[PDB]
Design a protein around this ligand. Structure first.
Ligand code: CLR
Ligand code: CLR
Lengths: 50, 49, 49
């Protein structure tokens, strides 16, 4: 039925969204970690921040 | 090495962010169930204990 | 000789990276555009009831 969403489905969709966000985060962290000076220039602002 | 350290720092802060998100959301979703007990109705139990 | 070979390899890697950036933009835009093009007409028609 479609009057409401069951708790089981809500939890599964929630953890799927969290896993998707964590996948995006892992891609970002890999992208930052593997930058080489022959491709990228050393961004000083983000370095100061982090 | 600088780039690797930046990645490590981002990894460290985002771990805590993700842990808080996961724990808080799961806890809210399941605490919704913990408070869905059968209402204390003004009736005797169906089966006498 | 190794330095020259590595510079040419780096040029190839740079080209691959530029392609990747362009394709990231294209594919995210296509995701949005398709998600709208499949549903938006019906959802607008139902909202306009
Ligand atoms: C994407 C992440 C953030 C959430 C994942 C869980 C989803 C499935 C949850 C989050 C909020 C939820 C909605 C919140 C409130 C209502 C109103 C109610 O009368 C019918 C169900 C409905 C419409 C829920 C459906 C399920 C829902 C959309
Ligand atoms: C999962 C995390 C990220 C978000 C949680 C949001 C909370 C507030 C949402 C998620 C599911 C929602 C519930 C889903 C369905 C119903 C049944 C409806 O008849 C009344 C509202 C009620 C009871 C919603 C209340 C709000 C609710 C508990």
């Amino acid at each position: 039925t479609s009057l409401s969403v069951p708790l089981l489905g809500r939890f599964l969709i929630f953890v799927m969204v969290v896993a998707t966000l964590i996948v995006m985060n892992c891609v970002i962290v890999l992208n930052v970690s593997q930058r080489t000076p022959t491709t990228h220039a050393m961004s000083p602002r983000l370095r100061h921040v982090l | 090495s600088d780039w690797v350290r930046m990645g490590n720092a981002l990894d460290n802060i985002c771990f805590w962010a993700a842990l808080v998100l996961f724990s808080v959301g799961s806890s809210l979703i399941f605490l919704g169930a913990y408070f869905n007990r059968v209402p204390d109705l003004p009736y005797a139990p169906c089966i006498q204990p | 000789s190794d330095q020259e070979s590595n510079n040419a390899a780096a040029e190839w890697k740079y080209v691959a990276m530029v392609m990747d950036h362009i394709l990231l933009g294209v594919f995210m835009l296509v995701c949005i555009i398709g998600t709208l093009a499949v549903f938006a007409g019906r959802l607008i028609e139902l909202n306009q009831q």
